[PDB]
Amino acid sequence: MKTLSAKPAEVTHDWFVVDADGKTLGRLATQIASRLRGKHKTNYTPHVDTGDFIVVINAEKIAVTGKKAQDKKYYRHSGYPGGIKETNFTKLIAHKPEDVLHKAVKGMLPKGPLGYAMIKKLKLYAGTDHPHEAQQPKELDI
Template structure:
């Protein structure tokens, strides 16, 4: 093998081609934010385990199920979750799992069990689980905004014609 250096050419901002001795070695694709195709999906959370559901939702919000996945570009889909109040947890988590938040005042730590959260705001249970699995920062917040969670069986996104996604 010769000691000639590799030659890298830039074909625009989104593709890089590396040549070695005039032969093509690799071609890296990078998704552009304006060309990403985003679909709408609807998921029924009835009887689904919270962690397993949240893992798959986070994966699809990031776009890791697509061939054109790029870590620094939001390539994920929109997801509508229905029946968040009927999500399941294993073991004694229904009574033992605690959710904490702080009001901002001194001594303002608040806690609630899983049962209390489901009774008060069932959407937050799935939102908290999914948000913890997404990247932290502006990109993760953009991915999280594509998640729509509803406690009941009705949603107001019929105009987007969501496809049923079985998880």
């Protein structure tokens, strides 16, 4: 008797829809990261991607508690001297509303080639309409 791996050829990725309207950013991102990593499956092995395809709608309506809408700052560096740029949660959700949840899930997910694959799996769409009618995903509440 040996402990077996998931044999990537045999793993199937299911499609789920998550409505981000009115949910807490971090508390939703933790669950999305867990689903993307595949921690809910009994065949989970750290080196195989066994997670699901998470489609998120109403990404701009994600909520943060306290004064974090006006005080949570996102920094980045351009690589040039003094090239440190800072934006707000509110301005970021106005400009690129996906990037908030994308960044939150990225920070939670592991770093590496396999983490890049799982973050590739993630699908985020603003608004109540998504171009995944063909996939026929399943509504999920979490």
